[PDB]
Design a protein around this ligand. Structure first.
Ligand SMILES: *[C@@H]1O[C@H](CO)[C@@H](O[C@@H]2O[C@H](CO)[C@@H](O[C@@H]3O[C@H](CO[C@H]4O[C@H](CO[C@H]5O[C@H](CO)[C@@H](O)[C@H](O)[C@@H]5O[C@H]5O[C@H](CO)[C@@H](O)[C@H](O)[C@@H]5O)[C@@H](O)[C@H](O[C@H]5O[C@H](CO)[C@@H](O)[C@H](O)[C@@H]5O)[C@@H]4O)[C@@H](O)[C@H](O[C@H]4O[C@H](CO)[C@@H](O)[C@H](O)[C@@H]4O[C@H]4O[C@H](CO)[C@@H](O)[C@H](O)[C@@H]4O[C@H]4O[C@H](CO)[C@@H](O)[C@H](O)[C@@H]4O)[C@@H]3O)[C@H](O)[C@H]2NC(C)=O)[C@H](O)[C@H]1NC(C)=O
Ligand SMILES: *[C@@H]1O[C@H](CO)[C@@H](O[C@@H]2O[C@H](CO)[C@@H](O)[C@H](O)[C@H]2NC(C)=O)[C@H](O)[C@H]1NC(C)=O
Ligand code: NAG
Ligand code: NAG
Ligand code: NAG
Lengths: 298, 202, 105, 116, 217, 196, 104
């Protein structure tokens, strides 16, 4: 009869509880305190305009129906008591395909404090949309957003809030960076009210600022192209009595400029506007063709 | 007080409720109004001859059994009570794979009204198949659709219509595609006839 | 430490016209700036929260307009009891207030 | 709904003071409690922050090590202890409650602390 | 009718958490296979696909009834109400059953308590190919299975005399290889939890150099 | 209050019903009538030797335990009543990985006629295997099969039959062609017995 | 290119629960895996995984065994796609160190 008292506490706790009714349905407004701990900022896909993130998502609120009194002040319960109480229905406005992990059991945490405060934590991987504007590729900086809020609960029923100071709420781990091509500079939180066809909802916004690294595209495209241009300008020092040599010079450098441009344009997505690598390739192609026409004239 | 009263109201509403039978099972057909808020059109793939779109898809009808008058306000219930009410069996004829988003819970909404009206919304990402005519490609313009039909109930059991009939589909002008540009959109009501009966279609 | 610079230090105006007070931040404070009113020998009272959200119990003549860095408070058709000190304070980080703004008739 | 502070008093330079702020109408374990200091005809200055549910505090770097904020949930009060006083401590001290998008909506009545 | 009475008397006082003869002797399970097709044998991931009809049969003295009918032929409805062995394939990377249009399972109970349980499986098994002598090579790589939780002293497996049967062998998806035969093997393996009876089926394949000739040679 | 009478009807129908037994277990042979409406003949993957096909699959049989007498002559019930009664376990002999759609509700249809006839319809996507002999590529013709039958029920228990004339039973829609590389010429049905 | 690895493992956990203690029979009790939904099991998870699953042929691949002194033995068969970041500055003459984290 050592565990019978806790069974009695939990039975009295769930005796008379309706998990279809939010706390304070016609009496008050439900206050939810949110927190995000990013365990790894995943890879940023440029052709799909998306990114991956792995977070501990924490939500706290107050339910006056779950007050108890016993030898412990906090009950660290399982992940099956959370399905027998009311939990908020938070969704991500710009999420594409997220997963809530359940290996080996559902990764959820519930702690009830003796005055009625609940802490509810989940571990989940979110795949969100990041609309990018690629004029300055590959020297561009982005602000990838992450907006979440409540589905079906308007502003007069459920409102969100950060649990700590807004500059110290979204916390990114140190080893959590799976970025090969970008660089995470900082975070930026925000809060607002959007309005849709069912009413006005509260939306909590987070911005991650990314800055692309140029060190790969330099060696990939910018240096072979300049080398090809220099090799085209080499031809101006040869003697005109060897016409097939300079002819094969000109035509093969135009051919190599074509192969580098085709092999270079597969890197970035199928955007409909011109970038800065296209301007570089176009001006260099103009220089090689100008050299060839100069050879033709001389 | 104010909580147990509403608890008794919902318990009275859900006691003795047969989910096998539609509202007005032996009477006139029930009208169902549709709304779509398109969030994004993701990828128009020529090789797969399909396109993905995310939408907020909402349905509204009237169930005379879910009518209450003790409290005067609207009831937004938890999204798990939608397994105990009657909801229409709507499907998309031309889709290939689809799902309701399930983070952090199943993204669906139920909402009752004191006169009996029920609002039922889902957040659906679906990959619909549309066959393109690439004779003039790449200088061409395609037209492809999303079909919304009822599977089980014929046109003498259910009626479909756009809720507003011109403002039923919103969010199309804010959609940005990398390759295309939405020039126009149209809404159509229809009735199709199969070997089992006549079915409504939007 | 985010500092808030308020402008101007003082403004003298009559009754009935529109008046505007400005507040500027050094760093980023995204719509987390509140406006308080302090009458002589009293405690400050919250007027506007968020960036544009009237507190429950304030008249409709106060209006807030917000951004990422530049904020403004506009009072249209002032009265004889709307003369007090006005402070802008940020809450994106640990809270810091402005220098104040006297309003005289 | 209401915050009641202690009464004004004088203090000799080099002593210690303990100001109190009793909350009535709510529970202090739900919100944060801020202490603000105002000099005559100057701007407000933030002293420190206490989280009564957990117990951790933060202080302004100018007041770090000089002030100590504590709480007592039984009597529903919050205390601010000032030590090693100087002549530049003559000010008005306010006790504020956080709420509605980090706004400090409810303030006290303010105590006048003078150093002779 | 009377079959309802028989099924309700069989399921009264029945506990599906305990195997038959839980403290008497091990249970003997006879296994048969029918290979519909052996899919593409790609060497990139070191794997191959196979489609089979896996059939098991054993003796359960609690499902013994007296009646004038000899056999109950049932759906998959009663599969989850009696004891079923936990057979699993040790060398599979991914494997799934079939559910269209109704779960493809079969249960048959006899007059003396003999139960036969059959289900259709699609397995993606792995076999390490030593790719020397390529493309003039021959392989023989297995499909193994055993019980997961029951050691040798609790469940013993045993082939029948007509164990593995192949189909037509011409409608199979073997492009680069050619099926030539098979052979069955039984062994006992040491594991941290105990001794397990493991059964193996080796398929012998030979690579036909008909594609690599006009591809590279 | 016209919902209590139909509730009493459905409760009398399900009082003592055993869905583990086929209709006519001791007296006759269950005869199921089948029908296929192809809404779109999907793409044929020649590199994998398989094809896709989207169908309405209809079955009909007679269950003498579901006779009733009420104001309606046909009950167009839900897709959650079909799980409490007996339904045949048809499977595709050459299907690879088929799916049954679940959007927004399970795409199933159950109709019960007053005399005991049941109509049961599903919408599903079959992915079947088509063995090809590519000796005359790319000037070849094929005949892709689709074999289905009963699992667990022999010939003396459950038999299948076409519901209409065999030439008019499998019906392909007009605009139901997602083919880019081939040209559908026609259909061909047959029925037989396999000795397993 | 994806910066990850896949591994199949037999993952076993052993603890001692005094409520599952018996003395009337002298043998160990291997139970059908369906009883694992009626017992308490620890909420172990892997921090650096991307997609995991328990195999499901012919049944759910797990094992539950009770011993007379209360020792419970609980085994799973998992296929984990764990993520590890690689330092490719010395490619292809490189050595990579990556690990799998097991936490509660
Ligand atoms: C993390 O979370 C993950 C997601 O939540 C989770 O994945 C889930 O795993 C669980 C458990 O393994 C799955 O639940 C089971 O799924 C089995 C089938 O799985 C295959 O199909 C599902 C989709 O399931 C639908 O279709 C099947 C078959 O038709 C149904 O059985 C299901 O109920 C469900 O059907 C409904 O939807 C249909 C349309 O789709 C409707 O037509 C129908 O009316 C229903 O509404 C796929 O998603 C699976 O793919 C995934 O999983 C596989 C596993 O191999 C992976 O390999 C793959 O990669 C995918 O990830 C897969 O293809 C169900 O059979 C099973 O239902 C039975 O078992 C449960 C548990 O024992 C019973 O409670 C239940 O009653 C069922 O038993 C009945 O039927 C059996 C048949 O043998 C009888 O023997 C038994 O007696 C019983 O009959 C009784 O009831 C009958 C009525 O139902 C009645 O007629 C009889 O008379 C009798 O009374 C169960 O639902 C779940 O699907 C997975 N979800 C997904 C999306 O993956 C994962 O496990 C979690 N991980 C961890 C570590 O926590
Ligand atoms: C499959 O296994 C069965 C049973 O072991 C084999 O049949 C036996 O084979 C051995 C060796 O040839 C004979 O000595 C026995 O007389 C056979 N009968 C039995 C019942 O054991 C069968 O040959 C095996 N088939 C293979 C190897 O593919
Ligand atoms: C319930 O919703 C309806 C329609 O949006 C609205 O008119 C009504 O005022 C709402 N309930 C009340 C009385 O607030
Ligand atoms: C299919 O839909 C039904 C009805 O909502 C649901 O019960 C079932 O779980 C769904 N199937 C899957 C695999 O989610
Ligand atoms: C039960 O398991 C324990 C632990 O391995 C072992 O020592 C003991 O011998 C087993 N019991 C029997 C009867 O084998």
């Amino acid at each position: 009869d050592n565990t019978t008292v806790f069974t009695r506490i939990l039975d009295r706790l769930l005796d008379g509880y309706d998990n279809r009714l939010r706390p304070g349905l016609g009496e008050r407004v439900t206050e939810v305190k949110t927190d995000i701990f990013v365990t790894s900022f995943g890879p940023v896909s440029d052709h799909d305009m998306e990114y991956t993130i792995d977070v501990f998502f924490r939500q706290s609120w107050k339910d006056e129906r779950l007050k108890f009194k016993g030898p412990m002040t906090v009950l660290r319960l399982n992940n099956l008591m959370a399905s027998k109480i009311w939990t908020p229905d938070t969704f991500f406005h710009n999420g594409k395909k997220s997963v809530a992990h359940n290996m080996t059991m559902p990764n959820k945490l519930l702690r009830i404090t003796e005055d009625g405060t609940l802490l509810y934590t989940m571990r989940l991987t979110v795949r969100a949309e990041c609309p990018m504007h690629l004029e300055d590729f590959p020297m561009d900086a982005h602000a990838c957003p992450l907006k979440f809020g409540s589905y079906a609960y308007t502003r007069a029923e459920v409102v969100y809030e950060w649990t700590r100071e807004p500059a110290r709420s979204v916390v990114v781990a140190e080893d959590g960076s799976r970025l090969n091509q970008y660089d995470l500079l900082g975070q930026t939180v925000d809060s607002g009210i959007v309005q849709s066809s069912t009413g006005e909802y509260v939306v909590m916004t987070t911005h991650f600022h990314l800055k692309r690294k140029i060190g790969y595209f330099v060696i990939q495209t910018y240096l072979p192209c300049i080398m090809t241009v220099i090799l085209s300008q080499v031809s101006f020092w040869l003697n005109r009595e060897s016409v097939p040599a300079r002819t094969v010079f000109g035509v093969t450098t135009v051919l190599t400029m074509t192969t580098l441009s085709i092999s270079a344009r597969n890197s970035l997505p199928k955007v409909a506007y011109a970038t800065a690598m296209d301007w570089f390739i176009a001006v260099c192609y103009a220089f090689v063709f100008s050299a060839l026409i100069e050879f033709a004239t001389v | 007080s104010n909580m147990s009263l509403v608890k008794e109201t919902v318990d009275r509403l859900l006691k003795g409720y047969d989910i096998r039978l539609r509202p007005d099972f032996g009477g006139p057909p029930v009208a169902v109004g549709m709304n779509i808020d398109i969030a994004s059109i993701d990828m128009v793939s020529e090789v797969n001859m399909d396109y993905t779109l995310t939408m907020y898809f909402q349905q509204a009808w009237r169930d005379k059994r879910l009518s209450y008058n003790v409290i005067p306000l609207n009831l937004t219930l938890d999204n798990r009570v939608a397994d105990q009410l009657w909801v229409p069996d709507t499907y998309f004829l031309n889709d290939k794979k689809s799902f309701v988003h399930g983070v952090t819970v199943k993204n669906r909404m139920i909402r009752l009204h004191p006169d009996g009206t029920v609002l039922y919304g889902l957040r659906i990402t679906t990959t619909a198949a549309c066959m393109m005519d690439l004779r003039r490609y790449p200088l061409d313009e395609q037209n492809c659709t999303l079909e919304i039909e009822s599977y089980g109930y014929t046109t003498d059991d259910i009626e479909f219509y756009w809720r507003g009939d011109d403002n039923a589909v919103t969010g199309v002008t804010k959609i940005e595609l990398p390759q295309f540009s939405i020039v126009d959109y149209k809404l159509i009501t229809k009735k199709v006839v199969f070997s089992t009966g006549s079915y409504p279609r939007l | 430490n985010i500092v808030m610079t308020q402008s101007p230090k003082s403004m003298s105006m009559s009754v009935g016209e529109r008046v505007t007070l400005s507040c500027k931040a050094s760093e980023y404070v995204g719509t987390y700036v509140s406006w308080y009113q302090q009458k002589p020998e009293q405690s400050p009272k919250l007027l506007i929260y968020g960036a544009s959200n009237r507190y429950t119990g304030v008249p409709d003549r106060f209006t807030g307009s917000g951004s990422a860095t530049d904020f403004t408070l506009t009072i249209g058709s002032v009265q004889a009891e709307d003369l007090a000190d006005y402070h802008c304070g940020q809450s994106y980080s640990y809270p810091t207030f402005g220098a104040g703004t006297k309003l005289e008739l | 709904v209401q915050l009641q502070q202690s009464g004004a008093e004088l203090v000799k330079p080099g002593a210690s003071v303990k100001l109190s702020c009793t909350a009535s109408g709510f529970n202090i374990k739900d919100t944060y409690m801020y202490w603000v200091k105002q000099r005559p005809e100057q701007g407000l200055e933030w002293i420190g922050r206490i989280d009564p549910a957990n117990g951790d505090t933060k202080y302004d770097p100018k007041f770090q090590g000089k002030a100590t904020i504590t709480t007592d949930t039984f009597s529903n009060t919050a205390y601010l202890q000032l030590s090693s006083l100087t002549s530049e401590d003559t000010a008005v001290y306010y006790c504020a409650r956080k709420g509605l998008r980090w706004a400090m909506d409810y303030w006290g009545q303010g105590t006048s602390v003078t150093v002779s | 009718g009377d079959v309802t009475v028989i099924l309700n008397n069989l399921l009264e006082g029945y506990d599906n958490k305990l195997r038959p003869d839980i403290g008497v002797k091990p249970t003997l399970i006879h296994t048969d296979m029918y290979v519909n097709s052996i899919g593409p044998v790609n060497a990139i991931n070191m794997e191959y696909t196979i489609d089979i009809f896996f059939a098991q049969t054993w003796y359960d003295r609690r499902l013994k009834f007296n009646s004038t009918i000899k056999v109950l032929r049932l759906n998959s409805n009663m599969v989850g109400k009696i004891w079923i062995p936990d057979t699993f394939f040790r060398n599979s990377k991914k494997a799934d059953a079939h559910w269209i249009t109704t779960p493809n399972r079969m249960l048959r109970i006899w007059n003396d308590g003999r139960v036969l349980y059959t289900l259709r499986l699609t397995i993606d098994a792995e076999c390490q190919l030593q790719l020397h002598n390529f493309p003039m090579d021959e392989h023989s790589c297995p499909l193994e299975f055993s019980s997961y939780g029951y050691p040798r002293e609790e469940i013993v497996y045993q082939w029948k005399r007509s164990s593995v049967e192949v189909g037509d062998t011409r409608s199979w998806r073997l492009y680069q290889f050619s099926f030539v035969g098979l052979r069955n093997t039984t062994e006992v393996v040491k594991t941290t939890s105990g001794d397990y009876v493991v059964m193996s089926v080796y398929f012998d394949l030979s690579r036909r150099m008909g594609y690599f000739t006009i591809q590279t040679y």
